[PDB]
Amino acid sequence: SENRAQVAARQHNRKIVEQYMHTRGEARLKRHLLFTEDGVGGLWTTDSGQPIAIRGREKLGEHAVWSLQCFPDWVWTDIQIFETQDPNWFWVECRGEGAIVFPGYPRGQYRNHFLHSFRFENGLIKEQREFMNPCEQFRSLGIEVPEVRRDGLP
Amino acid sequence: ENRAQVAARQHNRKIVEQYMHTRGEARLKRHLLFTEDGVGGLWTTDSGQPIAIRGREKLGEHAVWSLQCFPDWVWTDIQIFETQDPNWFWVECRGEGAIVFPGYPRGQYRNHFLHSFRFENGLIKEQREFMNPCEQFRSLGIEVPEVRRDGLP
Ligand SMILES: CC(C)CNc1ccccc1C(=O)c1c(-c2ccc(O)cc2)sc2cc(O)ccc12
Ligand SMILES: CC(C)CNc1ccccc1C(=O)c1c(-c2ccc(O)cc2)sc2cc(O)ccc12
């Protein structure tokens, strides 16, 4: 029953995506338990052009300690979960917001639009990736955003 | 109900495939894949507001400018994702080509992209693309600010 197995995987994996996206507050300290032991999470859109990949369940748990300090009230909002033809691959469109308390920058408020990719193995997240426009994070940190000159464009 | 959803998804997938493969002079007719009131454009920009091109006529005009400023643009590494909504698709891909922006040195632009396609009655109602604008800054010779990471693990 290939189809039955795929349907079961997709329904379970959707519940894990829902739980990830709704993880807030102190529960963030245990979000890494939604990953495989060698699972990877992180931010694929950064200033430098290289992803910030947090590799393995142990490092993901450490990242959560940092995130609770630097993003103390972070929430995902406007959550739309997309199943796909691959029962082990989901996409999520959402927004996120909260205070930003980044080391060495003034405290501020950060709001952005996000896309997330979730790939699963044996019922847990093998790879989570998030994609956003870093210019909005620059603005939240008081960093000047470059302005493309548009005079020559329609 | 299921038969109508399956029919829609299979047809719409072919339109996404056609859109993603469109290059060269065929770009001048890509707007014909949209509804008359369809919208396309870039949702991730320096200013923080989307550049939305509204209506099939304006989309056709944009293609003229695109062939000037991105004369050889190709989408590569195309992965199409169907969803539970037969009228909504996502695409993960890369793109590459010369960038010839007015008042900037000619450059080469490469980036990773996500696209969203929503359909109505067999045609694209809304196309949106999402990327990291910092790579487009680099292709234009624009300095990218650097977030200080010393205080981070
Ligand atoms: C709740 C979310 C808004 C948290 N966000 C992140 C999530 C995952 C990875 C990195 C970040 C992040 O915020 C950035 C850096 C960072 C590096 C090391 C580290 O241990 C912690 C954070 S460096 C950098 C540069 C940018 O241009 C944008 C973001 C980040
Ligand atoms: C093949 C693709 C790489 C084409 N790309 C675009 C697609 C749709 C919309 C805008 C762009 C674009 O490239 C930007 C601007 C632009 C504005 C008006 C116009 O008629 C033509 C282009 S302004 C700006 C600022 C940025 O920071 C990044 C991109 C753009």
Author numbering:
A (entry chain A): 11 to 164
B (entry chain B): 12 to 164
From the primary publication:
Modifications by the enzymes PhzE,34 PhzD,35 and PhzF36,37 lead to the highly reactive aminoketone intermediate AOCHC (2).38 Two AOCHC molecules then condense to the tricyclic phenazine scaffold HHPDC (3), either spontaneously or catalyzed by the enzyme PhzB, which is a homodimer and belongs to the nuclear transport factor 2/ketosteroid isomerase family. can be further converted into different biologically active phenazines such as pyocyanin (4) by the enzymes PhzG,40,41 PhzS,42 and PhzM,43 respectively. PhzB in its homodimerized form displays binding sites for two substrate molecules (2) in each monomer. The C-terminus of one monomer functions as a lid, shielding the binding site of the neighboring monomer and thereby contributing to substrate binding and stabilization of the complex. To this end, we initially confirmed the target by performing cocrystallization of RAL with a PhzB ortholog from Burkholderia cepacia (BcPhzB). The active site of BcPhzB features the same amino acids as the target enzymes from P. aeruginosa (overall sequence identity: 58–59%, sequence alignment: Figure S1) but crystallizes more readily than the P. aeruginosa proteins.
